[PDB]
Amino acid sequence: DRPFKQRRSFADRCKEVQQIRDQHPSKIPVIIERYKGEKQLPVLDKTKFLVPDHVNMSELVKIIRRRLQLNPTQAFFLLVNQHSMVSVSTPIADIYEQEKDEDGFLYMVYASQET
Ligand SMILES: CCc1ccc2[nH]c(C)c(CC(=O)O)c2c1
Numbered sequence: 001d002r003p004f005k006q007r008r009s010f011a012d013r014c015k016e017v018q019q020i021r022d023q024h025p026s027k028i029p030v031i032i033e034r035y036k037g038e039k040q041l042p043v044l045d046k047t048k049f050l051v052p053d054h055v056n057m058s059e060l061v062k063i064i065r066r067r068l069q070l071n072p073t074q075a076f077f078l079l080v081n082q083h084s085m086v087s088v089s090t091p092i093a094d095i096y097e098q099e100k101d102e103d104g105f106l107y108m109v110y111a112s113q114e115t
């Protein structure tokens with residue numbers, strides 16, 4: 001229920017990113033959460049994803065949409081720091097350094113609006 005940062009301390013989140021660097025070096029550590037004020041979209045089964053570093057952001061948008069099992073009419077947006085990723089056909093590795101959190105995770109939010 002509670003957001004990831006309310007379930008793990010800063011030090012623990014950093015240690016998890018370090019573990020992922022050692023055990024899955026070619027993956028980007030990603031946290032994907034439903035927007036707090038979201039009414040239309042369901043909650044994802046899981047929140048922590050290890051994304052192969054060559055995957056395009058625009059492809060991740062399509063993957064998460066499929067995982068939510070929506071109907072074709074439902075609006076869906078996947079945002080990194082409030083930037084919609086739908087047309088970002090750039091590898092996740094290339095945005096990781098600039099957009100990552102201080103803990104080393106890359107945080108994303110999904111919603112039925114882009115504000
Ligand atoms: C949503 C996470 C994600 C996104 C894109 C991906 N493309 C491939 C080949 C994998 C395999 C894997 O899970 O390592 C993968 C995982």
Ligand SMILES: CCc1ccc2[nH]c(C)c(CC(=O)O)c2c1
Pocket residue numbers: 080081083084085086087088089090095099
């Ligand atoms: C997360 C910041 C960021 C990183 C890479 C990006 N590449 C493109 C085309 C955009 C604009 C957009 O969001 O449409 C963008 C934004």
